[PDB]
Amino acid sequence: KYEGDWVNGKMHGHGKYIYSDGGVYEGDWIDGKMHGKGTYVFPNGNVYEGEWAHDMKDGYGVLTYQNGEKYEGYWKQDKVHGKGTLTYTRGDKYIGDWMDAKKDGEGELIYANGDRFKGQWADDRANGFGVFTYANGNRYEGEWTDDKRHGRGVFYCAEDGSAYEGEFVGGRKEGNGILRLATGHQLEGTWSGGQLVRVTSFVFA
Amino acid sequence: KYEGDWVNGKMHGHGKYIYSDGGVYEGDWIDGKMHGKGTYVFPNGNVYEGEWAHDMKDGYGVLTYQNGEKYEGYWKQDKVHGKGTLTYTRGDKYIGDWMDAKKDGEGELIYANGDRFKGQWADDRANGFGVFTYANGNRYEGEWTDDKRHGRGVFYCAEDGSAYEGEFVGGRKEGNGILRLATGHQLEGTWSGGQLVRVTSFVFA
Ligand SMILES: [Zn+2]
């Protein structure tokens, strides 16, 4: 069903269209394709209000999911792409680069609880250098692989004023590391499974 | 206004009463006083459903506040008193002893975020020995004054597997303390404002 403007033999102008699956589009048409600005209500409850080109979401658009989520940002050919903000169901926001619907490039994750992250992303996960700052003041800085602390990094416990500098495997302190205390002293040791299992030396300030 | 049972010259039996301030009571009456079981709707929106003696809340009763809170437990002469559970607006529960509407005696505070406390209370605040366990695994054990860590105590950081044993002032590590690490080594030092400001010695396992 179509209720709107016709030009030549195509839908062209403004009009509402009801799709075979039950979706509904109201907005701009050009040569029989969704093109310009219009809103689209999906059978699953998702709603898109934004810009279309050649029957696809393209340009700036807002997708209010029914599962509570909400994306505001840029699209190319029906996939989020470029700069955009995802507000998760429970308040957390991602703000940064997207590629083919995946977080890829540079981005922030601002959590509701006060925590905050900024770093490199790839394949929808933290991959590369990034800083995680907790609300209490704890902070990680270093390499990430697959959303986990992984590689060379520094973790600072704001409670004790101390900092670990060493390797991380799968989000856990692993191997030979340095433990710097607030007073400047260091402890060289070996970590396994994120736990200090052997102290080898005590270095002075 | 009263709508209910009369015996002799007093309200006696079951009946509804509307008070000059707008409160409403439906329930049991004995010799013209609220006595037995009945619910009372307050002008401010608070509702009490429970037990009364001699015109006062006395026995077991539930007070659903309008500000979201909710007390389930025991009353004596219109004040919470004895064992009772307070569910705070945002999920936190106190479960333990009350005296004259104040937390006093032994009690738990089960927080929504996973944290948990149990210890001695006085004048509505933690006073005496008590253990605080955080969701991550951090743990305090020792003395409390006025809802704050205060006196001799032990604080364990589950991240670093380390533990501070020393004095606390106003919830902050203060003075000469011992810093025990997971491997058994200790660091004797001085803390000021919760921060390690001088390391005096390094003790072996
Ligand atoms: Zn720590």
Author numbering:
A (entry chain A), B (entry chain A): 149 to 353
Paper text:
High-resolution crystal structures and biophysical analyses of a truncated form of the TbMORN1 protein and its homologues from the parasites Toxoplasma gondii (TgMORN1) and Plasmodium falciparum (PfMORN1) enabled, for the first time, a structure-based definition of the MORN repeat. All three structures are antiparallel dimers joined via their C-termini, and, when possessed of the correct key residues, can adopt extended or V-shaped quaternary structures. The crystal structures confirmed that each 23-amino acid MORN repeat is composed of a β-hairpin followed by a 6-residue loop that connects to the next MORN repeat. The structural studies presented here make a case that one conserved function of MORN repeats is in homotypic interactions and possibly also in higher-order assembly.
Although TgMORN1(7–15) was predominantly found as an extended dimer, a V-shaped form similar to that of PfMORN1(7–15) was also observed in the crystal lattice. The two V-shaped dimers share the same coordination sphere of a Zn2+ ion, which in TgMORN1(7–15) is provided by the Cys305 and Asp308 residues. The latter residue in turn interacts with the Ser310 from the other subunit. While the salt bridge and anion π-interactions are also conserved between the two V-shaped dimers, the aromatic stacking present in the core of the PfMORN1(7–15) dimer interface is functionally replaced in the TgMORN1(7–15) V-shaped dimer by a series of aromatic stacking interactions at its vertex. The coordination residues map to the β-hairpin of MORN repeat 13, which in TgMORN1 and PfMORN1, but not TbMORN1, contains an insertion of a glutamate residue—Glu307 and Glu308, respectively. Taking part in an anion π-interaction with a phenylalanine residue (Phe303 and Phe304, respectively), the resulting Glu-Phe pairs effectively stabilise the TgMORN1 and PfMORN1 dimers in their V-shaped form. Moreover, these very same glutamate residues further stabilise the two V-shaped dimers by being involved in a salt bridge with lysine residues (Lys321 in TgMORN1 and Lys322 in PfMORN1). The residues in the crystal structures of TgMORN1(7–15) and PfMORN1(7–15) forming the Zn2+-coordination sphere and anion π-interaction were taken as a fingerprint for a V-shaped dimer. Based on the crystallographic data, the apicomplexan MORN1 proteins appear capable of forming both extended and V-shaped conformations. MORN1 proteins in Apicomplexa have been shown to be a key component of the basal complex, which undergoes a constriction event at the end of the cell division cycle. It is therefore tempting to speculate that these extended (Zn-free) and V-shaped (Zn-bound) conformations represent the pre- and post-constriction states of the MORN1 proteins in the basal complex.
